[PDB]
Design a protein around this ligand. Structure first.
Ligand SMILES: OC[C@H]1O[C@@H](O)[C@H](O)[C@@H](O)[C@@H]1O
Ligand SMILES: [Ca+2]
Length: 773
């Protein structure tokens, strides 16, 4: 391996061998059906709201999120980089597809598959990833750096449906070597959203652009129809000419055949036929190829950039709404713009690279933080682009711009709900810290729902009761599902009735105040916008105080985020959240000079604080609640309210000394007595040091709960404890001794390591460990 010295891969990059098998992989621990796409994953490509593409550590384009809100795991074998090499003065060269695998069909059987083991590495530090190719049979060594321009405080390039592939080639040998790198791509118009004749009318064309200071060759893959449907638009692949390099192409090869139409050219001399053919296919799948060929002398290095774009301007949800995607603001809405997106990337990728480095550098260069932590911190951000992310630039048919662009991130794919509020309380930290205009938009979406009333009835899944869908003054659980109508039909969740949950209204308030504090305490307009909704939220929750202790009563059913774990009376969780939310509203009262509100929330806070301490402090920790079976259980999340109060700079809601003791107890029990502290914090533990078995949720580690608990510890000066607590999450996710959840971090696992709900929003909470950014 001499190529690694020629490129700049940080030490904290997640690493795995191309072709490596992994023996210890977790699987779902529920009886019911649940996504398991295996451990062959990698860092995603594509912007926010653009639909994303998951290219795996094996090289295949396999995890498809281009249909917004859906997850389709299937390798499109035609999509690859391939290499040709011939040493000067030998009869024949070698040609090899850079994919550690082979088609399951008999399609493309002429290509050279099964890139060998022990012959390269994959590296990820999102939004960059890299592959190195160090193969006995390839004398010139190659590396590619691939990324999308995902840039904090940038709402433009961050939306783009584009990926750059920057290749570096090095000849360490004493002989001249001819090299070709070829990009192949299937014309994927109809891969989704077409019910029949999925390839019909698809056609490819070649664009040669010789503009100012660049020559670019590209293939544009489209369809002859000018319909404005979810399925229609263009893909493009292409390359920028650099000195010492020639370009060739093939406009059309058949992906539903043996592939020799392309490969017989490539495997001869790494040079394609430059054959155009714009005729449209009917039943056969088609694709295009772009190749570069060059000669490398001993010790010579060369760099050449390829790119991929996809212009699929329309997203469709299951209820029938059709929206334009955010990037159409910058490139247009007609689905004919793939080349423009590509050309932007090819001419500006160096600038985008420097911008990525500029945002990563302050964490990367802090040598007081261990590399493993940097690995998790950056890589968990995969979920922002990958979580079914929807970012609308208008409804189809509207003739003018709206004043706002609505946004939604899925909780996950198995529970297909946008912006789950009990979840985003933990999971939205990267948004507020790095894309705060998106964050504030999401919270304004929630503000607008507060007084929405929907009297229609639904059957509650857990107990078969009938409940009203949406009650005035109660915050919704979510903003809809991709199977229905995101942003229009709310509360898609129906396992419990969220209109009687005791955490949502509080978490809403704390999220509002958080967004103000963490963006510099200057945005009074945001507090003004949200103020009525905050006051309404807290007032409705006060009404759920049955026994007059100043605190909402949990009703003996699961009426909060732990949605099968019953709480009754005053709970540590909902009670601390309530306290913190009252103190937050007092502050907002002060900022907005609203004396009535300030005085009311102060008086409610005083009563409630006093009673909380009395009812639940036991000398070592705070009890789970006042009235349940196992009410003395140690809950890992018992002081979630004080966690948020530290972040919001609201001070002590509970005595300093009592907090410190409860956290040391949580570490001593929930962490260190659960599999030797190597798997995170288990949610519930009996004071005898044994896992609480009152419910499955008590026996789970929640990844986002645990990272948040580490933030809390860290800010209370329990540094060792914080990082040890977080380490178990990292280990399970990324390490060879874990369970193979890289780029699909789940909600939860049990002591055996098996999971629930891969690709989950909550563990974005890791960014709460970085709160001064
Ligand atoms: O694991 C529990 C989670 O399950 C999801 O189905 C719900 O939407 C969340 O509200 C809940 O916190
Ligand atoms: Ca009460």
């Amino acid at each position: 391996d001499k190529i690694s010295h020629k490129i700049d891969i940080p030490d904290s990059a997640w690493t795995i061998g191309i072709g490596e098998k992994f023996k210890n992989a977790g699987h779902p621990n529920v009886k019911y059906p649940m996504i398991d796409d295996s451990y062959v994953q990698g860092a995603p490509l594509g912007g926010f709201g653009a639909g994303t593409i998951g290219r795996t550590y094996n090289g295949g384009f396999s995890r498809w999120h281009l249909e917004i809100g859906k997850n389709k795991y299937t390798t499109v074998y035609a999509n690859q980089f391939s290499v040709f090499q011939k040493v000067e003065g030998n009869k024949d060269g070698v040609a090899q597809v850079l994919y550690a695998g082979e088609p399951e069909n008999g399609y493309l059987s002429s290509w050279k598959w099964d890139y060998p083991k022990e012959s390269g590495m994959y590296y990820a530090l999102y939004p960059n990833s890299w592959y190195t190719y160090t193969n006995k049979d390839l004398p010139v060594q190659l590396a590619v750096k691939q990324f999308s321009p995902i840039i904090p405080y940038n709402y433009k390039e961050t939306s783009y449906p584009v990926a750059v592939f920057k290749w570096t080639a090095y000849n360490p040998t004493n002989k001249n070597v001819d090299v070709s790198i070829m990009f192949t791509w299937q014309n994927m118009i109809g891969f989704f959203g077409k019910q029949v004749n999925v390839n019909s009318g698809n056609f490819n064309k070649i664009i040669k652009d010789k503009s100012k200071d660049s020559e670019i060759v590209a293939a544009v893959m489209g369809n002859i129809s000018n319909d404005n449907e979810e399925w229609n638009g263009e893909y493009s692949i292409g390359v920028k000419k650099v000195p010492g390099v020639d370009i060739s192409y093939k406009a059309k090869f058949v992906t539903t055949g043996d592939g020799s139409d392309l490969w017989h050219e490539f495997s001869k001399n790494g040079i394609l036929d430059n054959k155009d053919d714009e005729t449209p296919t009917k039943q056969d799948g088609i694709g295009s190829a772009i190749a570069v060929n060059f000669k490398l002398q001993p010790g010579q290095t060369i760099e050449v950039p390829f790119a991929l774009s996809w212009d699929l301007p329309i997203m469709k949800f299951g209820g029938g709404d059709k929206w334009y995607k955010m990037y159409t603001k910058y490139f247009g809405k007609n689905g004919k713009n793939s080349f423009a997106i590509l050309k932007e990337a090819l001419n500006n990728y160096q600038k985008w690279e420097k911008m990525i480095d500029d945002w990563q550098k302050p964490i990367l260069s802090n040598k007081s933080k261990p590399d493993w932590y940097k690995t998790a911190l950056f890589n968990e951000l995969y979920y922002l682009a990958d979580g079914g992310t929807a970012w609308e630039n208008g409804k189809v048919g509207e003739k003018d711009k709206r004043t706002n662009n609505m946004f939604g991130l899925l909780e996950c794919f198995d529970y297909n709900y946008y912006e789950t509020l009990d979840v985003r309380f933990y999971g939205s930290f990267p948004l507020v810290m790095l894309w705060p205009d998106i964050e504030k938009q999401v919270m304004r979406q929630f503000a607008d729902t507060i007084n929405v009333q929907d009297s229609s009835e639904f059957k509650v899944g857990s107990n078969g009761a009938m409940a009203v869908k949406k009650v005035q003054g109660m915050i919704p659980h979510d903003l809809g599902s991709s199977y229905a109508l995101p942003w229009i039909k709310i509360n898609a969740y129906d396992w419990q009735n969220p209109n009687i949950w005791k955490d949502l209204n509080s978490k809403y308030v704390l999220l509002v105040y958080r967004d103000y504090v963490l963006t510099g305490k200057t945005d009074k307009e945001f507090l003004k916008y949200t103020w009525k909704s905050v006051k309404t939220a807290l007032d409705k929750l006060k009404e759920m105080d049955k026994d007059n202790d100043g605190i909402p009563d949990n009703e003996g059913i699961p009426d909060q985020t732990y949605d099968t774990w019953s709480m009754k009376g005053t709970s540590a969780y909902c009670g601390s959240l309530w306290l913190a939310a009252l103190k937050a509203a007092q502050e907002i009262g002060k900022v907005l000079k609203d004396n009535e509100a300030y005085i009311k929330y102060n008086e409610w806070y005083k009563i409630a604080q006093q009673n909380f301490e009395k009812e639940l402090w036991n000398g070592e920790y705070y009890n789970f609640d006042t009235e349940s079976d196992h009410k003395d259980s140690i809950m890992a999340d018992q002081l979630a309210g004080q966690w948020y109060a530290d972040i919001l700079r609201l001070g002590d809601i509970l005595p300093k000394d009592h907090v410190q003791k409860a956290l040391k107890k949580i570490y001593e029990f929930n962490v260190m007595k659960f599999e030797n502290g190597k798997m995170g914090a288990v949610n519930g533990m009996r004071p005898d040091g044994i896992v609480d078995e009152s419910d499955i949720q008590a026996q789970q580690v929640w990844t986002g709960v645990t990272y948040a608990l580490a933030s809390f510890m860290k800010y209370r000066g329990m540094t060792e404890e914080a990082y040890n607590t977080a380490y178990g999450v990292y280990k399970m996710t990324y390490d060879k001794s874990g369970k193979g959840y890289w780029f699909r971090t789940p909600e939860a696992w049990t002591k055996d390591g098996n999971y629930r709900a891969s690709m989950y929003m909550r563990p974005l909470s890791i960014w709460s460990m970085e709160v001064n950014y």
